[PDB]
Design a protein around this motif. Structure first.
Motif, short mmCIF file in Angstrom:
data_model
loop_
_atom_site.label_atom_id
_atom_site.label_comp_id
_atom_site.label_asym_id
_atom_site.label_seq_id
_atom_site.Cartn_x
_atom_site.Cartn_y
_atom_site.Cartn_z
N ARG A 7 0.70 -1.23 -0.14
CA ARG A 7 -0.13 -0.08 -0.15
C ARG A 7 0.58 1.21 0.11
O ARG A 7 0.49 2.26 -0.50
CB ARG A 7 -1.10 -0.10 1.07
N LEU A 8 2.10 1.26 0.48
CA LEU A 8 2.97 2.18 0.36
C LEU A 8 3.46 2.40 -1.18
O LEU A 8 3.99 3.24 -1.74
CB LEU A 8 4.19 2.49 1.30
N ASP A 9 3.36 1.26 -1.95
CA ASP A 9 3.62 1.30 -3.19
C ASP A 9 2.67 1.57 -4.15
O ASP A 9 3.15 2.51 -5.14
CB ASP A 9 4.01 -0.28 -3.69
N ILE A 10 1.38 1.35 -3.88
CA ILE A 10 0.33 1.97 -4.65
C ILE A 10 0.03 3.29 -4.28
O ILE A 10 -0.30 4.16 -5.17
CB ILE A 10 -1.04 1.00 -4.50
N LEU A 11 0.03 3.49 -2.96
CA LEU A 11 -0.16 5.16 -2.74
C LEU A 11 1.20 5.78 -3.00
O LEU A 11 1.18 7.08 -3.15
CB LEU A 11 -0.34 5.02 -1.29
N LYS A 12 2.50 5.11 -3.27
CA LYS A 12 3.36 5.84 -3.95
C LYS A 12 3.32 6.38 -5.32
O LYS A 12 3.60 7.06 -5.86
CB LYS A 12 4.59 4.86 -3.63
N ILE A 13 2.51 5.29 -5.91
CA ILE A 13 2.37 5.66 -7.73
C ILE A 13 1.35 6.71 -7.68
O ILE A 13 1.39 7.50 -8.22
CB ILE A 13 2.00 4.18 -8.41
N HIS A 14 0.37 6.36 -6.93
CA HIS A 14 -0.85 7.39 -7.21
C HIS A 14 -0.48 8.72 -6.39
O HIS A 14 -1.01 9.67 -6.87
CB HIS A 14 -2.18 6.67 -6.51
N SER A 15 0.50 8.65 -5.46
CA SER A 15 1.06 9.92 -5.08
C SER A 15 2.12 10.37 -6.16
O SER A 15 2.23 11.54 -6.23
CB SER A 15 1.59 9.72 -3.83
N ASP A 43 -3.12 16.76 4.02
CA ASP A 43 -4.16 16.79 3.31
C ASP A 43 -4.57 15.29 2.72
O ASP A 43 -5.59 14.83 2.66
CB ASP A 43 -4.06 17.56 1.84
N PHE A 44 -3.42 14.53 3.19
CA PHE A 44 -3.35 12.91 3.16
C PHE A 44 -4.14 12.63 4.58
O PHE A 44 -5.02 11.62 4.23
CB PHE A 44 -2.15 12.37 3.07
N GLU A 45 -3.71 13.20 5.56
CA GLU A 45 -4.22 12.67 6.95
C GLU A 45 -5.72 13.06 6.94
O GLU A 45 -6.66 12.07 7.57
CB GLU A 45 -3.54 13.53 8.06
N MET A 46 -6.45 14.19 6.38
CA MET A 46 -7.66 14.32 6.41
C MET A 46 -8.52 13.79 5.10
O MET A 46 -9.67 13.51 5.23
CB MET A 46 -7.93 15.87 6.42
N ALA A 47 -7.59 13.26 4.17
CA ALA A 47 -8.03 12.31 3.06
C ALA A 47 -8.57 11.13 3.86
O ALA A 47 -9.77 10.63 3.78
CB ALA A 47 -7.14 12.29 1.88
N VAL A 48 -7.47 10.33 4.11
CA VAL A 48 -7.46 8.93 4.73
C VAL A 48 -8.49 8.99 6.15
O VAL A 48 -9.17 8.06 6.44
CB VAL A 48 -6.31 8.30 5.02
N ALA A 49 -8.41 10.23 6.85
CA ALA A 49 -8.99 10.20 8.02
C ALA A 49 -10.54 10.66 7.75
O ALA A 49 -11.40 10.68 8.58
CB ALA A 49 -8.55 11.45 8.94
N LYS A 50 -10.85 11.15 6.32
CA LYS A 50 -12.28 11.60 6.14
C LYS A 50 -12.78 10.21 5.45
O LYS A 50 -13.85 10.05 5.98
CB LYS A 50 -12.06 12.60 4.84
N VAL A 51 -12.09 9.50 4.63
CA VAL A 51 -12.81 8.44 3.77
C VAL A 51 -13.23 7.24 4.78
O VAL A 51 -13.84 6.01 4.18
CB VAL A 51 -11.88 7.92 2.77
N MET A 52 -12.96 7.13 6.07
CA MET A 52 -13.40 5.96 7.10
C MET A 52 -14.83 5.87 7.23
O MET A 52 -15.28 6.38 8.12
CB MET A 52 -12.55 6.32 8.22
N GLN A 53 -15.52 5.60 5.97
CA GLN A 53 -16.93 5.61 6.12
C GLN A 53 -17.46 4.35 5.55
O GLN A 53 -16.96 3.75 4.45
CB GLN A 53 -17.39 6.98 5.34
N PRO A 58 -5.71 -0.46 6.70
CA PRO A 58 -5.55 -1.98 7.42
C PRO A 58 -6.41 -2.98 6.43
O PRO A 58 -5.78 -4.17 6.38
CB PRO A 58 -6.45 -1.58 8.59
N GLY A 59 -7.42 -2.48 5.90
CA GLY A 59 -8.09 -3.43 4.88
C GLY A 59 -8.20 -2.89 3.65
O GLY A 59 -8.75 -3.69 2.71
N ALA A 60 -7.85 -1.81 3.47
CA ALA A 60 -7.79 -0.76 2.34
C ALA A 60 -8.10 -1.68 0.96
O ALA A 60 -8.54 -2.81 1.03
CB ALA A 60 -6.42 -0.30 2.06
N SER A 61 -8.14 -0.97 0.06
CA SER A 61 -8.37 -1.54 -1.43
C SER A 61 -7.65 -0.73 -2.50
O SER A 61 -7.19 0.34 -2.33
CB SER A 61 -10.00 -1.41 -1.48
#
Ligand SMILES: Nc1ncnc2c1ncn2[C@@H]1O[C@H](COP(=O)(O)OP(=O)(O)O)[C@@H](O)[C@H]1O
Ligand SMILES: Nc1ncnc2c1ncn2[C@@H]1O[C@H](COP(=O)(O)OP(=O)(O)O)[C@@H](O)[C@H]1O
Lengths: 332, 333
Positions: free
Chosen positions: A265-273, A322-332, A292-295
């Motif tokens: 997930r640091l690899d895929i978030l590395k690419i999309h980042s 902005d990452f932290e409120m992104a991933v802290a936003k999408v926990m829905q 933790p269970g991401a996608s």
């Protein structure tokens, strides 16, 4: 003086030819307009069997300077201006599949940017370009043929993109029969014509006999079968599908997609980042900290939302938070 | 000089037959000198006929063709543009023989007479007296012979070989379905003789469209007459599921079945696939006979394929039977 005079003859003759085809141009445009249409190809002495645009049929002739020998079916060009006789050829005008590829434009070009899957690409490249570009060690190894791969994993994370990427490293084709909206058995002809092809499927249970019917329907024709066509089925769960597919080996390959761990997930978030601007330093680990269970998607979503959360303050560099409120936003 | 009157056609007749000829689907043939034609538009046209045309394709109304200015039935519709383009009328045959089936031998013998013997030696029956029987069902458990293997071998020493499946028989849009088997037993009937495969009919997944569809493989099988319509071979996994109306030992004749393997065909069918492979030192039956306490016909196909592939990932055409164990846990465990 005579040589320079003949240069003036070249100038005067050039302008006089301009006024030739302008004068007979203004009398010329009083003639007719040729029609246009696809055909089913000829059989006999001259011949065509056209189908013109408004009303789709006729059988017409062909002019001497057309060489009826190359004009092949589904390659629209016509000119039977009035008496109905051919003249020449035009832009091929994209054959059938060009249609359901550009139309279902769903397939998005992908190449090697797969976010941390290497066992999976080792196994699919073990069974998708070895049976295409090196058949010689399969016809001497005693293997009959590998065909048909089932991609079972969570929704996201490997679908429509692994089967896309290794379809186009090989430059094979990528036919998708996902959905039957607007038009089985006719698709096989197109695949055969392409020579080599890859057919892809659909996965719907949640984000009775949906597409396992066509699945086997093309494994029945595919089992006895002009040989380098490889069906691909993506499903969310291996247990939900038919017992007829549970027939080893009907699915010569059951590749498994796990949900991504920390480093993938640091690899895929590395690419999309690697899609956008960031700053002098991120150290992306803390975002992957709660992966933790991401996608697969759950990563493209938060990277675009981190970009928008940098966009809201009219700021041109995506900071850390902005990452932290992104991933802290999408926990829905 | 018999080829002298042929050239009068291209100076007196082809001037009529040879223009922007139009094609419109033919209709109810009023007697000899005329016909009615609905054109491509939908406008009917009471056309005339041609004298020199050798009329044989009059059926009210396959897409006949016409003249543009005057209206007639100038030609006919060779290049039929065959409906059901992809139904597997086999020209390039697959790769199965009498030998590689090698297992169930009684069964392939019985289907070998029941399809092939009215072709390879049709002069038993009328000299003896009986009719030849119709197509079989050949049901079985899953992987018990490739049900579609003893029909495939029944392909490759005969004439044309037309198939169907439960999937081509049922339909979504339809409301109007039982058409598929109308023109499947009309195209099937036309070849004289062709074999039609009701591949795996098992009808699962309102219900009444399936009911009428089964009623038309039923009746369109045996309504009033038949051409050379042996090959109605039905493969089936669930014989207790389908309605016992198909077999009136008329609609479906004599039928042949099998136990799954025995160990004799675990050995004899195991050594067909790996005959292509290169393993020689420790070809075994202890990992094959009582290993899974009966393993399908396919599980040995997948054990040979997954075996040689799993020893092919590490790039050697070698004989390792410990990689074969990883193939066993890999394919069925
Ligand atoms: N390992 C990965 N590498 C790159 N993109 C991924 C990965 N996993 C998921 N994705 C994202 O998923 C999307 C592709 O959808 P897909 O995975 O085919 O849907 P599904 O998960 O239903 O198969 C892409 O936009 C892609 O960014
Ligand atoms: N001699 C044989 N003995 C047992 N099984 C075989 C033999 N030859 C082929 N098969 C298997 O039969 C399968 C195809 O027919 P079948 O087993 O009847 O499938 P299904 O029963 O699902 O139609 C193939 O997977 C093939 O590996």
């Amino acid at each position: 003086k005579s040589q320079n005079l003949r240069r003036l003859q070249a100038q005067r003759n050039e302008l006089n030819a301009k006024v030739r085809l302008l004068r007979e141009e203004l009398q010329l445009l009083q003639e007719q307009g040729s029609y246009v249409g696809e055909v089913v190809r000829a059989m006999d002495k001259k011949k065509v069997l056209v189908k013109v645009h408004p009303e789709g049929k006729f059988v017409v002739d062909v002019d001497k300077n057309i060489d009826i020998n190359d004009v092949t079916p589904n390659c629209r060009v016509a000119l039977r201006n009035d008496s109905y006789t051919l003249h020449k050829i035009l832009p091929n005008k994209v054959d059938p599949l060009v249609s359901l590829m550009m139309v279902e434009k769903v397939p998005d070009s992908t190449y090697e940017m797969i976010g941390g899957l290497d066992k999976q690409i080792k196994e699919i490249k073990e069974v998708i370009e070895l049976p295409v570009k090196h058949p010689e060690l399969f016809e001497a190894l005693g293997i009959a043929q590998p065909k048909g791969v089932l991609l079972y994993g969570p929704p996201g994370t490997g679908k429509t993109l692994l089967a896309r990427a290794v379809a186009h490293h090989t430059d094979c084709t990528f036919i998708r029969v996902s959905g039957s909206e607007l038009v089985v058995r006719e698709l096989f002809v197109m695949a055969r014509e392409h020579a080599p092809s890859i057919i892809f499927m659909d996965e719907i249970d949640s984000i009775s006999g949906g597409d396992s019917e066509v699945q086997r329907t093309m494994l029945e024709l595919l089992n006895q079968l002009t040989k380098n066509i490889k069906v691909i089925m993506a499903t969310n769960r291996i247990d939900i599908l038919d017992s007829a597919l549970l027939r080893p080996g009907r699915i010569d390959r059951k590749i498994e997609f796990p949900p991504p761990n920390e480093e993938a997930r640091l690899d895929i978030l590395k690419i999309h980042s690697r899609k956008m601007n960031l700053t002098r330093g991120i150290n992306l680990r803390k975002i992957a900290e709660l992966m933790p269970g991401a996608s697969g998607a759950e990563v493209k979503g938060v990277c675009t939302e981190a970009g928008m959360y940098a966009l809201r303050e009219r700021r041109v560099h995506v900071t850390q938070e902005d990452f932290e409120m992104a991933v802290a936003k999408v926990m829905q | 000089p018999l080829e002298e009157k042929q050239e009068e056609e291209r100076s007196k007749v082809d001037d009529l037959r040879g223009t922007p000829m139009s094609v419109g689907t033919l209709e109810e043939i009023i007697d000899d000198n005329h016909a009615i034609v609905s054109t491509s538009v939908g406008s009917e046209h009471y056309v005339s006929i041609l004298s020199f045309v050798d009329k044989d394709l009059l059926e009210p109304g396959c897409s006949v063709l016409l003249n543009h200015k005057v209206h007639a039935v100038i030609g006919v519709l060779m290049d039929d543009t065959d409906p059901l383009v992809t139904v597997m009328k086999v020209e390039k045959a697959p790769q199965e023989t009498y030998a590689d089936i090698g297992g169930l031998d009684n069964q392939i013998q019985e289907i070998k007479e029941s399809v092939e013997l009215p072709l390879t030696h049709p002069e038993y029956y009328e000299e003896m007296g009986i009719k030849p029987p119709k197509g079989v069902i050949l049901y079985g458990p899953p992987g018990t012979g490739k049900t579609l293997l003893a029909k495939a071998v029944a392909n490759q020493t005969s004439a044309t070989f037309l198939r169907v499946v439960g999937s081509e028989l049922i339909q979504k849009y339809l409301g109007d379905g039982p058409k598929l088997v109308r023109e499947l037993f009309r195209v099937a009937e036309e070849h004289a003789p062709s074999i039609v495969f009701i591949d795996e009919i098992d009808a699962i997944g309102g219900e009444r469209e399936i009911q009428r569809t089964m009623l038309e493989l039923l009746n369109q099988l045996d309504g009033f007459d038949s051409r050379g319509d042996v090959k109605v071979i039905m493969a089936t996994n669930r014989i207790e599921t389908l309605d016992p109306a198909l077999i009136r030992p008329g609609r479906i004749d004599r039928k042949i079945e099998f136990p799954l393997p025995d160990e004799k065909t675990k050995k004899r069918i195991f050594q067909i696939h790996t005959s292509r492979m290169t393993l020689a030192d420790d070809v075994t039956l202890d990992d094959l006979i009582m290993a899974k306490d009966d393993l399908s016909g396919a599980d040995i196909k997948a054990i040979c394929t997954e075996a040689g592939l799993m020893a092919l990932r590490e790039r050697r055409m070698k004989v390792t039977n410990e990689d074969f164990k990883k193939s066993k846990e890999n394919v069925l465990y």
